[PDB]
C-alpha cells in the first residue's frame, strides 16, 4: 500500500506473549495445518489466576500433562508486535498487553 | 623426662590461652595499637612474640 | 482432584501453517525510558525502513527515528498468541526481537566538531 | 549522595543553581529537562568508611561449611546459633571485630566492647 509505511497500532488490538520450551515448540510443528494445527488448549483457573497449557491427545499418547505458566510483568518496556507480509507491507498488529512464560512439565 | 614433658606441654598449653586472651581482647576491639602500627599488625607482634618464648 | 470449580479452556490452534504473514511476526520492543506513545497525533505516520540490515522507524520530519537491532536467540522460543472472537486462540512464532533503537536527536552540527575540540584537548 | 537521572533520557542530572531563587537543580545536557534537588548534598567523599563490613550477607550465609559458628546469645530471639565473620572491608588498618549473622532472626550483632551499632 502506502511503501514503506506502517499500518494501524492505533486500533489497540491486545496480544500475548508467551515463552515456550523449546521441545514444546518442536511438538507444535508436527501437528498438520490442514488440520488446522490444533495443538492442545488453554486452561484458565480462578480461585486465583492460574493458566496452564496442555497438548491434545493426538500430538501424545500418555495422559496430558499440564504446563503452567508463570504470568509476568510487561515490564518497562513496551511491546509491539509488527509482521511483514510476503507483499512485504509492514503492519503494525498490535500491543503486548501479557507476558506470561510455558514452564516446561 | 616422662615428668618434663608434662612441663612442657603445660608451658605450650598456658602460652596457647595468653593467645586466645590477646584474641579475645582484638575481637572485642579492646586492643590499643602501638604509635606506627596496624591494630592488626601489633596484634600478630604479641601472638609471634608469645609463641617463641614458649618454643624457648 | 474433582474440579468443584469451573475452568475456562479455550482451544489453542497450535500455529496455523499458512498464512500470509505466516512467515513474519516479529517483536518491536521500545524501553520505557524512550517513552513512546503510539497515540500522538504526530505518531499518526510512521515508516519503517531496512537500513541498507537494522530496522530504521522514523516519523514525520521533526520527530525522533528509531533504529532496530535483532535480539541473540535461545532454547526457548516467543510465541504470540491472539484470541479469535470465538475464544479460540492462535499462535504465530515469533520471527525476530528487534530492540528499538532509535534517535534523540540534537545530535546535528556536532559530534564531529564536539570530538576535534575534545582533540584541541590532549 | 544517591542521584536522580532524567525521565525522557535516562542520561545523568548536572547540578544547576537558580540564581533568581537562590535553589539547587537537576538539569539534564541531552535534553531541556529540569528538577528541582532533593537534598542539599552534591558530593560526598568519605575517607573513613565503614561500607564494606557487612557486604553479602545473603540469608543462605548459613550454608557456608567454610563459616565459624558460636553460641553467643543474640540480641533479638536469644539465639545461641549464628555464623561469624570480620570486617569484610579489605583494609589494612582494619579492626579484628568480629560480626555475628543469627541462624532465626539474621540480625547482624557485634563482638565491639567500644562503640554501638545498627549495621
Ligand atoms: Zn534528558
Ligand atoms: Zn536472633
Redesign the interface.
Known amino acids: 500500500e502506502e511503501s514503506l509505511d506502517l499500518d494501524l497500532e492505533r486500533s489497540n488490538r491486545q496480544v500475548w506473549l508467551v515463552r515456550l520450551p523449546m521441545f514444546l515448540a518442536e511438538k507444535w510443528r508436527d501437528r498438520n495445518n490442514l488440520h488446522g494445527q490444533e495443538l492442545g488448549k488453554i486452561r484458565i483457573n480462578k480461585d486465583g489466576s492460574k493458566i496452564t497449557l496442555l497438548l491434545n491427545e493426538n500430538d501424545n499418547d500418555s495422559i496430558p500433562h499440564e504446563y503452567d505458566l508463570e504470568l509476568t510483568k510487561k515490564v518497562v518496556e513496551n511491546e509491539y508486535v509488527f509482521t511483514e507480509q510476503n507483499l512485504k507491507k509492514t503492519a503494525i498488529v498490535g500491543t503486548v498487553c501479557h507476558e506470561c512464560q510455558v514452564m516446561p512439565s | 623426662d616422662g615428668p618434663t614433658m608434662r612441663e612442657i606441654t603445660e608451658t605450650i598449653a598456658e602460652a596457647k590461652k595468653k593467645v586466645l586472651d590477646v584474641?579475645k581482647e582484638?575481637?572485642?576491639?579492646?586492643?590499643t595499637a602501638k604509635h606506627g602500627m596496624?591494630?592488626?599488625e601489633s596484634?600478630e607482634d604479641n601472638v609471634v612474640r608469645f609463641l617463641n618464648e614458649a618454643r624457648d | 482432584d474433582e474440579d468443584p470449580n469451573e475452568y475456562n479452556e479455550f482451544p489453542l490452534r497450535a500455529i496455523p501453517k499458512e498464512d500470509l504473514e505466516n512467515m513474519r511476526t516479529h517483536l518491536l520492543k521500545f524501553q520505557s525510558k524512550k517513552k513512546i506513545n503510539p497515540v500522538t497525533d504526530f505518531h499518526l505516520p510512521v515508516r519503517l525502513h531496512r537500513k541498507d540490515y537494522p530496522w530504521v522507524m522514523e516519523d514525520f520530519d521533526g520527530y525522533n527515528t528509531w533504529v532496530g537491532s535483532y535480539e541473540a536467540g535461545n532454547s526457548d522460543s516467543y510465541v504470540l498468541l491472539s484470541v479469535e472472537d470465538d475464544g479460540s486462540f492462535t499462535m504465530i512464532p515469533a520471527d525476530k526481537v528487534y530492540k528499538f533503537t532509535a534517535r534523540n536527536k540534537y545530535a546535528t552540527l556536532t559530534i564531529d566538531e564536539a570530538e576535534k575540540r575534545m582533540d584541541k584537548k590532549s | 549522595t544517591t542521584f536522580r537521572f532524567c525521565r525522557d533520557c535516562n542520561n545523568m542530572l548536572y547540578p544547576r543553581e537558580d540564581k533568581e531563587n537562590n535553589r539547587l537543580l537537576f538539569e539534564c545536557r541531552t535534553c531541556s529537562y529540569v528538577e528541582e534537588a532533593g537534598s542539599p548534598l552534591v558530593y560526598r567523599h568519605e575517607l573513613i568508611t565503614n561500607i564494606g563490613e557487612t557486604a553479602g550477607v545473603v540469608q543462605d550465609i548459613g550454608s557456608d561449611p567454610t563459616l565459624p559458628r558460636s553460641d553467643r546469645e543474640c540480641p533479638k530471639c536469644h539465639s545461641r546459633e549464628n555464623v561469624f565473620f570480620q570486617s569484610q572491608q579489605r583494609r589494612?588498618?582494619?579492626?579484628?571485630?568480629?560480626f555475628f549473622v543469627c541462624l532465626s532472626c539474621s540480625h547482624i550483632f557485634t563482638?565491639?566492647?567500644?562503640?554501638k551499632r545498627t549495621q
Request: net charge positive; no cysteine; hydrophobic share 40%.
Open positions: 584474641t582484638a575481637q572485642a576491639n579492646l586492643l596496624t591494630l592488626r596484634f | 589494612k588498618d582494619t579492626s579484628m571485630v568480629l563482638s565491639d566492647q567500644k562503640n
